[PDB]
C-alpha cells in the first residue's frame, strides 16, 4: 500500500486522476498494479513538463482517445504531416512533427530500439528519458534546450530517489510494467 501512498503524495491530483482513468480503461486496479500506476503518473508528468517548456507543443497524451484522435486529425489536415498509426504523445509546431515520449527504468538505447521498432514510422520523433539522467532522441535531436531537459531529468531522478527512500525503487525498476 506504500506505492499508492507515495503516488498520491508526489503527483498532483490532476495527474493522479488521469492515471486512474487510464487504468480504468485498461481494466487495471491501481491498488494492485501499483508499479504501473506510478509509471503512468511519471510518464504523464513528463509529457506535461515537455509540452509546457515550449505554445510550441500540442499535448496529445492525457486526452481520451476520441479527443486525442480529433486533435491528431486536425493537425494532419492543417499541416499535411502523415497520420501516425499509434497515438503519439505530443506535436511539435516548430519542427512540425509528432513526438513519442519514452520513460524507462532500463538503458535508454534498449527502450529507444523498442519504441522505434514498435511505431515503425520514420516521421514520429522519439525521445527517451531514463531515471539516471540519460536521454536518447532520434538523430540525437533533443528538441528542447538544455535547461528544460535538465528540469525533466531532475524530476525523474527525484522520483527515483523518493521511491528509494521508501524502499519502492527496487520493485519499480525490476518491473517493465508501464513501458
Ligand atoms: N498512449 C500511450 C503510451 N503507453 C505506454 Br505502456 C508507454 C508510452 O510511452 C506511451 O506514450
Ligand atoms: Mn502516449
Ligand atoms: Mn510515451
Residue numbers in the entry: -1 to 52, 74 to 198
Question: What does the literature reporting this entry say, word for word?
Answer:
Among the most important influenza virus targets is the RNA-dependent RNA polymerase acidic N-terminal (PAN) endonuclease, which is a critical component of the viral replication machinery. PAN is part of a heterotrimeric RNA-dependent RNA polymerase complex, which is composed of PA, PB1, and PB2 subunits. The PA subunit, which enables endonucleolytic cleavage, is composed of a C-terminal domain that is mostly structural and an N-terminal domain that is catalytically active. In native PAN, the Mn2+ cations are coordinated by His41, Glu80, Asp108, Glu 119, and Ile120 and five water molecules, producing an octahedral coordination geometry at each metal center.
Finally, simple deprotection of compound 14 under acidic conditions results in the nitrile-containing MBI 9. Among structures, compounds 4, 8, 9, and 10 break with the chelating oxygen triad motif by replacing the carboxylic acid oxygen with a nitrogen atom. Interestingly, several nitrogen-containing isosteres were found to have a bridging water molecule between the nitrogen of the hydroxypyridinone core and a nitrogen from the isosteric groups (see compounds 3, 4, 5, and 9). Compound 9 showed relatively poor inhibition, due to the loss of a strong interaction with Mn2, which cannot be provided by the nitrile isostere in this context. Previous structures have shown bidentate hydroxypyridinones coordinating to Mn1, with the ketone bridging the Mn1 and Mn2 metals with the hydroxyl group bound to only Mn1.17,21 Consistent with every structure reported in this study, compound 9 bridges the metal ions through the anionic phenolic group, while the ketone group interacts with Mn2 and Lys134.
